[PDB]
Amino acid sequence: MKNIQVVVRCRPFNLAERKASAHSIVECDPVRKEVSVRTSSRKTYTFDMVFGASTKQIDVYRSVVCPILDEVIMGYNCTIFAYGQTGTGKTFTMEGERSPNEEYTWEEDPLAGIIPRTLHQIFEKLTDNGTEFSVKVSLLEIYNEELFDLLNPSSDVSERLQMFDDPRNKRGVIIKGLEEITVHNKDEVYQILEKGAAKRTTAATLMNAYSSRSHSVFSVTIHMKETTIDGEELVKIGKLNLVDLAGSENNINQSLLTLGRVITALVERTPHVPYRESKLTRILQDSLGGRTRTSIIATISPASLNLEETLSTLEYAHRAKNILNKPEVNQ
Numbered sequence: 372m373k374n375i376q377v378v379v380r381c382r383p384f385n386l387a388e389r390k391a392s393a394h395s396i397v398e399c400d401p402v403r404k405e406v407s408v409r410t411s412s413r414k415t416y417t418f419d420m421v422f423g424a425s426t427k428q429i430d431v432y433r434s435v436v437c438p439i440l441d442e443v444i445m446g447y448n449c450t451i452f453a454y455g456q457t458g459t460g461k462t463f464t465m466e467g468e469r470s471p472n473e474e475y476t477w478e479e480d481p482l483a484g485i486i487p488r489t490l491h492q493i494f495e496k497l498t499d500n501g502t503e504f505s506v507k508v509s510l511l512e513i514y515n516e517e518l519f520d521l522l523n524p525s526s527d528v529s530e531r532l533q534m535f536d537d538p539r540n541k542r543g544v545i546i547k548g549l550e551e552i553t554v555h556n557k558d559e560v561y562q563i564l565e566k567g568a569a570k571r572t573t574a575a576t577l578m579n580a581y582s583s584r585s586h587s588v589f590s591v592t593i594h595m596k597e598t599t600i601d602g603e604e605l606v607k608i609g610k611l612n613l614v615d616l617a618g619s620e621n622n623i624n625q626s627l628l629t630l631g632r633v634i635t636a637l638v639e640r641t642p643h644v645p646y647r648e649s650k651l652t653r654i655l656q657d658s659l660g661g662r663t664r665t666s667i668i669a670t671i672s673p674a675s676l677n678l679e680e681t682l683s684t685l686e687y688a689h690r691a692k693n694i695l696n697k698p699e700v701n702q
C-alpha cells in the first residue's frame with residue numbers, strides 16, 4: 372500500500388577530507404533526484420529526494436518533514452530514521468546543533484534540525500487548527516542492547532529499562548518506566564531538549580564510543596479530539612518517531628546487524644523477519660513492513676576518504692525503497 376520513502380543528504384567537505392579533483396566524486400542532482408558517484412566510471416542511484424552539500428536545515432525540514440507532520444496530524448504513525456557513516460550528519464539532520472553566544476533563539480537557530488523545528492511547528496499548526504490536543508515526548512537510547520532514558524528527571528542515567536510486548540499492539544513494545552513528558556506549549560520545549568542533551572553527555576562518560584554506537588529514539592505522541600457531524604467524539608493519536616541510528620560502519624552491534632537482516636528479509640520477501648532478535652527492531656517492528664509511514668534519510672560524505680562507506684550507504688538505502696508498509700490511522 373505504501374513504499375518506504377528514501378532520501379539522501381550529502382554534507383559539505385569537512386576539515387579532514389582532501390578534494391584533489393576538479394569534478395566531484397559525488398554529484399547530487401535534486402531535480403532528477405539522482406546521486407552519482409565516481410568510483411571515469413560512475414554509479415547513479417535514483418531516490419525519492421536528493422539534497423546536496425549546500426542544502427540548509429530549513430530546506431530539509433520543509434521538503435521532508437512538513438508533509439510527514441501533516442500525516443501525523445491525520446493520526447498516522449510515522450518514522451523518520453537517519454542512516455549513514457559516523458561523521459556524515461545523522462545527528463546534525465535529526466537534532467541539529469545550538470549556535471553560540473545566544474546569537475539566536477532556539478526557534479530561529481539556523482543550525483537547529485528536525486526535532487526542534489517539528490516540536491515548534493506542532494504548536495503553531497494545532498493552535499490555529501482550533502483542535503483540542505496534548506503532546507508528550509520521550510527520548511530513549513539503545514547501546515549494547517540496553518535502554519537508557521534521557522528524560523527521566525530524577526534517576527542516574529545508568530539505571531537501564533526493560534521492554535515487553537504490548538498487549539494492545541501485535542507489532543509493538545512498551546518500555547517500562549520510560550519517562551513521557553507532556554509539553555504544554557512551545558516555551559516548555561527547549562528545557563526538555565536541554566535536559567536530554569545533558570544527560571546524554573553523562574552517558575557518554577560511562578560507555579565506549581557512545582555517540583557512534585548508540586541509536587537515539589525521540590518519540591512525539593499527539594492526542595487530538597474532534598467532534599463528528601453525527602455528534603460523536605473522535606480521538607486520534609498521531610505518533611512521530613525520529614530515529615538517529617548507530618553509525619553504519621560498525622551485542623555492541625546486535626541492533627544494527629539485525630536491522631540489516633530485517634531489511635534484507637523484507638525486500639527478498641523471505642518468510643521470517645527477525646524483528647525479535649534486537650531491541651531496535653522490536654521497537655521499530657511497525658516502521659519496517661507494518662502500519663507506519665516510514666522515511667529514511669541516508670547521509671553520505673562527498674570525499675574520496677569515505678567513498679567505500681558512502682557507496683555501502685547508498686546501496687543499503689536504495690534497496691530499502693522496496694519495503695512495502697500498510698499505513699493506518701489511529702481513529
Ligand SMILES: COc1ccc(C(SC[C@H](N)C(=O)O)(c2ccccc2)c2ccccc2)cc1
Pocket residue numbers: 462463465466467468469470477478480482483484486487510561564565566567568589
Ligand atoms: C533530542 O533532541 C534534541 C536535543 C537537543 C537539541 C539542541 S542540539 C543537540 C545536539 N545535537 C547534541 O548532540 O547535544 C540543543 C542543544 C543544546 C541545548 C539544548 C538543545 C538544539 C535544540 C534546538 C535548537 C538547536 C539545537 C536538539 C534536539
Ligand SMILES: Nc1ncnc2c1ncn2[C@@H]1O[C@H](COP(=O)(O)OP(=O)(O)O)[C@@H](O)[C@H]1O
Pocket residue numbers: 381382383385424426455456457458459460461462463464468618670
Ligand atoms: N549538512 C551539513 N552542513 C554542515 N555541516 C555538517 C552537515 N552535516 C554534518 N555536519 C558537521 O559534520 C560533523 C559530523 O556531524 P554529526 O551530526 O555528528 O554526524 P553523525 O551523527 O552522523 O556522526 C559535525 O561537525 C557537523 O556539524
Ligand SMILES: [Mg+2]
Pocket residue numbers: 461462463582583615
Ligand atoms: Mg550522531
Ligand code: NA
Pocket residue numbers: none
Ligand atoms: Na547488563
